[PDB]
Symmetry: C2
């Protein structure tokens, strides 16, 4: 009887006060799911647990100690139990799209068999080839344009009511979305940052009043030349839901950002200039001067990358339903040639959600498609949780190629030892031509009052 | 203006009503930090935003659409601004502990400089060497204990009151904690699932349901792991985990917490399992039972990542002109302070704690972070503390290899014409010689589920 973190709910109604039909989480329970609770709190957040214990945000390392808080962590008084476990992702090696789909759809233990038992458990009939006594065995997997249709092999003759009527299981509408957080990289091949030039000069205090309260700002326009390779072809059908900057690797800063909904393969590189502005707030004593140095660099990186693209697809089960064993909510006995489709992946609507239909299986007005509590009493809760955990298992594909970028940047503005004015104003020269040629454009040194 | 997900807060006070000094987040702000809001929400949770909009739990895909809710995501009307960035981790290849400490502490751009500058902004004196006029230059790094010390070179002579008293930055108390979720492996060198035997039988009935055929047995794994270098006798995990699944050769290895990675290189672990089915045996009929037993061994090169954390002790005297010590001691005292760069230990040692709680006078008892900002300007201090606090992690690599004996599911077949009788042959002596110990089949009735 485990505490399920997705059912925790946090209320702001004072000490140990939880909403209605909710009760406070205790220390032993917060302990068994600490990583989960803390990961759902603000950095320096502090929320209450039962009996005067508190759990602190991640910035405090998620410590649980005696305390009091105005907001509490609450757990249902009537939790929904038996959640579908969530197994580890099934990683399929990169390749062109039919090799990736192909590899998935022919996997007996991780696909063919688990989806067959599903069509079987829900009441569909003849879910297996006629050269076997077990479900999901001896199945012919054929192509169907964009889709794949797995259907029991019919070679020969069968015996049973409409036994020559095998349930078809068809896979379609495949989509691949890249998870930017999945970034990883092989050995950094090319790598280095050459100091191409170092600008030095002075900042002078021609006054009897010491100066402070002025910022010395530097601004340049540098370019970033980057390029990337796509080893296989899936690359052309995969996309990102929302843009992201290419990850920092090395010390070498770069500003490259990938676009959403535009195929990975179409984004292979380019040159992009940027406007950067370095700055310092010096303090030069009266009738004195301080030295200012600025180190300019060129850098480059080369390394093999790898991101993961999750796969989702529509799963249609079509065939007639059994007599005296059907999971549909109305429970037909007339053997209707039923046709239903679940979406394995991100949510779309309630009808195609096993998880949604399964977690709501007790709100009477919710059960309008399949009768999940029916399947449970027929088969048993574990049987069903292991069946749905495998059919719902996360499937990810590797996306790879090579990465290479090159850029020029300036370190910060560094000041020296104030020295007695010789026998704020800047005496630091810039040769716009030489820097344009070193890859630095529009470089300017401004002086502005602090604020 | 920037929204900071660490300042979001959720209230449950009716529709669009936030707690005091807080205001509802609007669809255009929630959108920008979606990933974070959603990550903070229950599976099918729905939370309100500003102007009749709503954000849906991760189960509904985290979608923001017009709606209404009696719980709201609020943000401060008064937000702490200028948070210190967070850069991506800095990776140090595997080597011996002294090599991994060396690669960190000697890096000028990523360590001698940011750290020297921190000491310099806090008012510490003579944070450079006699051969240079800039901060963090001409410094010496030297072994001392199982820690090191950075301090300006004192050869030559100098200019300045007590200028021969350089500030020393001492790094020690290194710790390395392994992060399980960093698992990665090379080319899997060996993989193969072979069918050893298949117990077959007949669930016999002379219908009958509410019965569960239960198969209880013993799995077994043999493994070994190597450890390319030595850091490994120092790396540990705060939590015990379960070695990752790769391939489809089921394993059952548990890496214990608080032990050197190198004192856990292999073994043999048995673990009993229960397989169960609920048959619906027609009257006077026989249903077939099949159980496949297998053998597989996997073996590949691995690599995990350990978070390196250490203590930073600044020792030297504070300047009269101005230091950041909250009481601004004008008598140039000898100052000693140490920050813990890693998991939070206490407020005195947390730059971030102190920095994020800088506007709350009650809290300012160590360094005055508002003073440094005024003195040097806000983007300088936050770009400096981001390099001082940038996560650093070392790789732990080596070769792994395992073999196990697991059993597929007990599958039933179509029932054929003929207290539930189970005709299923099992010679425990044979299964034992084959590697399966304690195999047995049973029938117990059903009352729940």
């Amino acid at each position: 009887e485990p505490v399920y973190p997705d059912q925790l709910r946090l209320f702001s109604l004072g000490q140990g006060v939880c909403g209605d039909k909710y009760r406070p989480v205790n220390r032993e329970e917060a302990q068994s799911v600490k990583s989960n609770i803390v990961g759902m709190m603000g950095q320096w957040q502090i929320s209450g647990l039962a009996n005067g214990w508190v759990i602190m945000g991640p910035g405090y390392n998620g410590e649980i100690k005696p305390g009091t808080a105005s907001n509490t962590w609450c757990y249902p008084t009537n939790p929904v139990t038996g959640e579908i476990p969530t197994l580890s992702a099934l990683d399929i090696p990169d390749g062109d799209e039919v090799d990736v789909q192909w590899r998935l759809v022919h996997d007996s233990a991780n696909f063919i068999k688990p989806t067959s038992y599903l069509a079987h458990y829900l009441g569909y009939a003849w879910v297996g080839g006629n050269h076997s006594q077990y479900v999901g065995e001896d199945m012919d997997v054929t192509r169907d344009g964009d889709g794949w249709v797995i259907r029991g092999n019919n070679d020969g003759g069968c015996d049973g009511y409409r036994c020559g009527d095998k349930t078809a299981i068809k896979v379609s509408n495949f989509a691949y979305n890249l998870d930017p957080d999945s970034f990883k990289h092989g050995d950094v091949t090319q790598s280095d940052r050459q100091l191409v030039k170092t600008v030095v000069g002075w900042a002078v205090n021609d006054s009897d009043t010491p100066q402070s309260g002025y910022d010395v700002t530097l601004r340049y326009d540098t370019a970033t030349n980057w390029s990337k390779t796509n080893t296989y072809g899936l690359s052309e059908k995969v996309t990102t839901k929302n843009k992201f900057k290419w990850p920092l690797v090395g010390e070498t800063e770069l500003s490259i950002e990938i676009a959403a909904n535009q195929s990975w393969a179409s984004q292979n590189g380019g040159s992009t200039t940027t406007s950067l502005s370095q700055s310092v707030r010096p303090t030069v004593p009266a009738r004195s001067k301080i030295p200012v140095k600025i180190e300019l660099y060129k850098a480059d990186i080369s390394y093999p990358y790898e991101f993961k693209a999750d796969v989702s697809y529509d799963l249609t089960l079509s065939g007639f339903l059994r007599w005296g064993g059907n999971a549909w909510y109305t429970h037909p006995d007339n053997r209707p040639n039923w046709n239903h489709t679940f979406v394995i992946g991100p949510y779309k609507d309630k009808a195609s959600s096993i998880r949604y239909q399964w977690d709501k299986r007790y709100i009477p007005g919710e059960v309008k498609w399949w009768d999940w509590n029916w399947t449970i009493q027929q088969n048993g809760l574990s049987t069903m949780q292991n069946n749905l955990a495998r059919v719902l298992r996360p499937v990810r594909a590797g996306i790879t190629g090579d990465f290479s970028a090159e850029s020029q940047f300036a370190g910060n503005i560094e000041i020296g030892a104030p020295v007695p004015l010789a026998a704020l104003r800047l005496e630091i020269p810039l040769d716009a031509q030489e820097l344009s040629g070193l890859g630095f454009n529009n470089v300017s040194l401004s002086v502005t009052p602090a604020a």
